[PDB]
């Protein structure tokens, strides 16, 4: 029940080919259960409740940056087998740890303990 990763990030909405950020800034964190199943959860900072919780298996998805609108920190989660795409934006004021979260997320989604 340990959290592999955790950082402030909000979700976005993709309609057709346009991605709009959601003001419901949350927290993107990863937790591995005793079942060795990595739990990808997104909790809204508004209430601090876990709004999203999806188990992600190795090579199931890929966490990468979104070089479409350079200005801040935007990442997209693509399910290699889920054929699903999610968009998130980091609420961290400094990117000194942006790469760490990015690297850890991938390492926890494709390289679990």
């Amino acid at each position: 029940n340990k959290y592999l990763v955790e950082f402030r990030a909000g979700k976005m909405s993709l309609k057709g080919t346009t991605v709009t950020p959601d003001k419901r800034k949350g927290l993107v964190y990863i937790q591995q259960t005793d079942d060795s199943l990595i739990h990808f959860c997104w909790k809204d900072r508004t209430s601090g409740n876990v709004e999203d919780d999806l188990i992600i298996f190795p090579d199931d998805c890929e966490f990468k940056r979104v070089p479409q609108c350079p200005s801040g920190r935007v990442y997209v989660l693509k399910f290699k087998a889920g054929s699903k795409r999610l968009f998130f934006w980091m609420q961290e004021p400094k990117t000194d740890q942006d790469e760490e979260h990015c690297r850890k997320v991938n390492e926890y989604l494709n390289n679990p303990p």
Binding site: L14, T17, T20, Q68, C69, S71, V74, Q91
Partner: peptide
């Protein structure tokens, strides 16, 4: 204290 959220943009699966 906290950074403002990004802005709307076009996304293409390249």
């Amino acid at each position: 204290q906290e950074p403002e959220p990004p802005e709307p943009f076009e996304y293409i699966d390249d």
